[PDB]
Amino acid sequence: MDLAPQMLRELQETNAALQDVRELLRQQVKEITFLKNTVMECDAC
Amino acid sequence: MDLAPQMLRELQETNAALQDVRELLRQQVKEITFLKNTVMECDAC
Amino acid sequence: MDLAPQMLRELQETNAALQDVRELLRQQVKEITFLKNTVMECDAC
Amino acid sequence: MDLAPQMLRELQETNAALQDVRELLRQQVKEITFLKNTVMECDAC
Amino acid sequence: MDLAPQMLRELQETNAALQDVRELLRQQVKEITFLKNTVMECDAC
Ligand SMILES: CCCCCCCCCCCCCCCCCC(=O)O
Numbered sequence: 297m298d299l300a301p302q303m304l305r306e307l308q309e310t311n312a313a314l315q316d317v318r319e320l321l322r323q324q325v326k327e328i329t330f331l332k333n334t335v336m337e338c339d340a341c
Numbered sequence: 342m343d344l345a346p347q348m349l350r351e352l353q354e355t356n357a358a359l360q361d362v363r364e365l366l367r368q369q370v371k372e373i374t375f376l377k378n379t380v381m382e383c384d385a386c
Numbered sequence: 387m388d389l390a391p392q393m394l395r396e397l398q399e400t401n402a403a404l405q406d407v408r409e410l411l412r413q414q415v416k417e418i419t420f421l422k423n424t425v426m427e428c429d430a431c
Numbered sequence: 432m433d434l435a436p437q438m439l440r441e442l443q444e445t446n447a448a449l450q451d452v453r454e455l456l457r458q459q460v461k462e463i464t465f466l467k468n469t470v471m472e473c474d475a476c
Numbered sequence: 477m478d479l480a481p482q483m484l485r486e487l488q489e490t491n492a493a494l495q496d497v498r499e500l501l502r503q504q505v506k507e508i509t510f511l512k513n514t515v516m517e518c519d520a521c
Contacts, residue, residue, distance in 0.1 A: 299345040300389045306352035307396035313359045314403045317366060321407060324370045325414045331377045332421045338386035340475060340520055341428035344435045351442035358449040365456045369463060376467045385430060385475035385520060390479045397486035404493040411500045418504060422511045430475060430520035434480045441487035448494040455501045459508060466512045473521040 335341065380386065425431070470476070515521070 299349050303345065303349050303352060304389050304393055304396065306349065306356055307393060309356050310352070310359060311396055311399050311403065313356065313363050314400060316363050318403055318406050320366045320370055321410045324373060325410055325417065327370060327373045327377055328414055328417045331373065331380060332417050334377070334380050335421060335424055340385035340430035341424070343432050344439045347439050348442055351439065351446050354446050355449055358453050362453055362456060365460055369460050372460065372463045372467050376470060379471050383473070383476035394479050394483050394486065397483060401486055401489050401493060404490065408493055408496050411497060415500055415504045415507065418507045418511065422507050422514065425511060425514050428518065431518035434484045438484055438487055441484070441491055444491050445494060448491065448498055451498055452501060455505055459505045462505065462508045462512050466515060469515055475520040
């Protein structure tokens, strides 16, 4: 049978997961920047 | 026809890896978020 | 139905997503690098 | 088959790169978890 | 309009982008590891 439709589906699923990855990474950078600033203001340092 | 069978296989393996990457990132941001909270409550700071 | 047109759009979307992922990772490495150096010169250490 | 052979090779290269990204991320999570436990079990905090 | 040529270019771009991601990730793991060790040798803890 024709595997093109399934190939398109795999690509669509790839983009779905990749979009989730982008959102996670985006949040993570925010958490890391917050961690950085907090450490910068650590009196012990 | 064409290398459709082979290309599909590469796409499926890629999706499987991306899904794992997604879950790894998910867990990672969690750990970072915990680390962040632990530092915010660190009396040394 | 020729699916090439749709597949191409998926590939383009993938690259756009990756461009964002790369930019985010680039900024994240900079934050971590700064966090590293800050902890390195921490008084209480 | 036209550019099919070349496209398949790009896909294989992509899967190889992803495997490496996965292994790197798996190592990174372990370092973050250790870091998390370290700060969590810190005395000064 | 034959889209294969353009599809090949997108795939090659995905690999170029992924190589950049892998490069950034390996450097990031190094920075995170340095951070981990630095905290481990931090007297304050
Ligand atoms: C035609 C085939 C599809 C091509 C899609 C390629 C898959 C995209 C790979 C995405 C890799 C991103 C990994 C996350 C980056 C690491 C973030 C972190 O530091 O935690």
